[PDB]
Amino acid sequence: HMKFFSLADEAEFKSIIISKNKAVDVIGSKLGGQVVSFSDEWFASAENLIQPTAPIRDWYDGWETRRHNEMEYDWVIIKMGVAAAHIIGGEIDTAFFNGNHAPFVSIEALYDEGEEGNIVEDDSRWVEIVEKFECGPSQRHLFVRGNGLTKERFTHIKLKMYPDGGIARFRLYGRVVPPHIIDLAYVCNGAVALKYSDQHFGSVDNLLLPGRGHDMSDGWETKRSRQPGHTDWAVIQLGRESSFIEKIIVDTAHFRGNFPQFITVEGCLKTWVELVGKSKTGPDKEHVYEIRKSIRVSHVKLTIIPDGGVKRIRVWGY
Template sequence: MAVQSIGPETLKYIATSKVRSIAADKIEATFRSRCIDLISKPLGTQILSFSDEWFAAAENLTTPTPPVRKPGVFVHSGAWYDGWETRRHNPEPFDWVVIRLGVASGKVEGVEIDTTFFNGNHAPEIAVEGCFGSNDEEIKHPSFKGWETILEKQDCGPSQRHAWALEKITDKAYTHVRLLMFPDGGIARFRLYGVAVPVFPQSIDDVFDLAAAVNGGVAVSCSDQHFGTKDNILLPGRGKDMGDGWETKRTRGEHVDWAIVKLGMSGEVDKIVIDTAHFRGNFPQKVQVFAGTFETEPSSRDSGWIEVLSPQNAGPDKEHKYGENVLQNVKGSVYSHMKLVIIPDGGVKRFRVFGRRRA
């Protein structure tokens, strides 16, 4: 796919939107109710190329968990760091890393740069560029000229989370991004908040996972996520351990926990899968599912919720599959949101909603 070439002088003045700085303690509230991290490693994102990674690997940028520290631990290149760190005295204007998104393409709403534990060796300034294309070999090459600015150059400080919201969101979608670090240094994590622009099946009768993050699904809210985040239930695959699922804290007495998912496309539901992979002593006793059609984000107590799966016994480390013989109020009904209820608490690895698009 041909990509318009933009010279460096033009890039200097292009900005896709006005930028608003987000305080570290507001990042989750700002982005996590309507966005996913488009470059989270579990989505299948790939580091295609980089200018340098002498002290610490660029791959660490997309690790979904917070950075950690190992004081006093040294490797061949120097002190061990959980992030991306390049050599000192870069002769070029900036270091860079090229990343292919974990979704077919995505629209960007915000950027987070985390320099946690990088103090004295942090990146002084950063910028983010993007492009839309299919030729990884061309895009990853240093001579590629098709980049356009997503986030213009921003200052960074030591050992802290930095985030910026793009005030004017356009219909521009990207398949790849390039993170620029001026002139060199270290960054622990890079998050690119936005919404997936999926490639849906051509036929409206084809069945696919309406809730999957790669198909535009977003976990918009939940009652609790003490041990594992709600966003994990929409990721591909069955994960690697309990850490990449959704897990709530222990409760006492009568209680339920819940997570609300906005489907990537409104549709008619055929099958629901609730996976408790790796949750062997902390799975829910029962699971229950409600569905609804909403123009705005619903609350858990909204009157528009309709029960589509009555409470069912759950088991450890297992995919629980519920088809037409168990589901109710789904035939001929079109829903935009689902509410997964776990009784009374516990952990769920994945939540799948298979159906046909009807919007």
């Protein structure tokens, strides 16, 4: 019942994951995903599986276990960085494991309330959500569950590899369940980056992450453009339709020689209306636009002029 997408068809995969199911990688370290435990890690750390970077050759950039596992499977337990989610799909990348790749993978999940302790492998609450499937050498596998979004919500993921081997990356896509003003554009509140002009370095989904990040690689950055009147833009579905917007924050943290010259922010109800008009931007700073407007919008569009890099956007309201 799992459905797999060719690399040539990643655009269509992203369509389903993001545009239709409003999903994000809920186990990525960049939104606070954490490896809780693992069976084994002999050749290469489990922690590599959730790193934001694409895997590289030169050590192995991945999780790899000892040979001849006497158990049926090796495993890793991962706590999501969001509070809870319904699961739609994922990615397993066996990059550079050319024969010693994981032969088969399955995925289970559970829902835990109290950070009461470190979850164990044989917890009765584990529920299979992706049935066992075959993997190939050194490649990306893009999957969607046959039944679409998981009915129940979950907080923790178990990856099973039968019986042992290597995996470079593991992404798991889910529609976040959000847990008085909030950041309507925050990833943990169900906000998702939908559409973009260009992503040269980083990605638009980085706009909605916790923190101000560490360097340029964890924001959204576009190429140096030359055409007069060029802009770049990013559309964000908010976690909720707004009733009020208090405050918009555009953060150029770490973008020092490549921050946009100007920005605007529009909102719309899914017909775009202005929230922030043309505003001069600076390097490496949180720009705070007080809006204080009773308005009903479902999406925002951030426009950077003519190009450059923004670390985050925050849309405070309710």
